[PDB]
Ligand binder design. Structure first.
Ligand SMILES: CCC(CC)CN(C[C@@H](O)[C@H](Cc1ccccc1)NC(=O)O[C@H]1CO[C@H]2OCC[C@H]21)S(=O)(=O)c1ccc2c(c1)OCO2
Lengths: 99, 99
């Protein structure tokens, strides 16, 4: 689809067998989700945003379905203000910016 | 043009007589620029992201040229680590997400 930006580009995602809403975020290198239970092993990591740095749980090679498009990649879980889909998965679903 | 997301979607902008590199950021409601001394009246604002909030100065009706496309709107200025073009101006240059 072609998504205009007069509203927040929010979409439904499926991860760990659960539906969630997430923001397509071209300014994010990485995908960061709010606190949730995810299966598999994880490593502690730090990530920085506009206001500072936070501790996150890094899950590798996780399936997320983004508006029916499959991606398998790294998902960070921690105290982000919003579920964000970052470029690491946006590229997997073939997302581009156009103007 | 079409911008893939393999790398950060950085583009050249023109603001207040200065050329800068800025992120085309679909996850940003507002446009936030690195500290710079603009003339005119402003209002204090707080904007939140990963790591917490930063204090910024809100300037209204500021003209920004984004890869040759002119836009005019609200621009926030503060201690951000990156110049961020938000949705308030992305809509004005006809920027869409596509996948
Ligand atoms: C509330 C949803 C997002 C944060 C979750 C909002 N951000 C825009 C993101 O694109 C920032 C934009 C950003 C980019 C680099 C540095 C600081 C901010 N990216 C970001 O935080 O990404 C982080 C996760 O991947 C990593 O790669 C970049 C930082 C990490 S933000 O920079 O904090 C931002 C911008 C304009 C705004 C605002 C918040 O509130 C209203 O107006």
């Amino acid at each position: 689809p072609q998504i205009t930006l007069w509203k927040r580009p929010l979409v439904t995602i499926k991860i760990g067998g659960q539906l969630k809403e997430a923001l397509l975020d071209t300014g994010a290198d990485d995908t960061v989700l709010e606190e949730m239970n995810l299966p598999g092993r994880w490593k502690p990591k730090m990530i920085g945003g506009i206001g500072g740095f936070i501790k996150v749980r890094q899950y590798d090679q996780i399936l997320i379905e983004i508006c029916g498009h499959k991606a398998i990649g790294t998902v960070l879980v921690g105290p982000t203000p919003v579920n964000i889909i970052g470029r690491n998965l946006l590229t997997q679903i073939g997302c581009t910016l156009n103007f």
